Amino acid sequence: GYKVEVGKNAYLPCSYTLPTSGTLVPMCWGKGFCPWSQCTNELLRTDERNVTYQKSSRYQLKGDLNKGDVSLIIKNVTLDDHGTYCCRIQFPGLMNDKKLELKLDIK
DSSP: OEEEOTTSOEEEOOBOOOOSSOOOOOEEEESSSOOSSSOTTEEEEEOSSSEEEEOOSSEEEOSOGGGTBOOEEESSOOGGGOEEEEEEEOOSSSSOOBOOEEEEEEO
């Protein structure tokens, strides 16, 4: 698990292999273990082309999304932001979904 210190910025890597004609797949960042469909506690989320749910402000995708970089970044972390996180790549269909549980431990 990653160790950020209180007040600092958290960084959680998460990317997917982008096909030839940049076709973006919807994804979802959700605090807490990955469930079974959708993100349990949504922090940020993509459509195609950019966000659809975005209490975004602290939370951002500091990498470029149109190349498969949907890495999350969290500004000024308290102890609240510690726990499990989830970048879910939602592929067209059911039972695809590249689930990724990242752990964050504040210090």
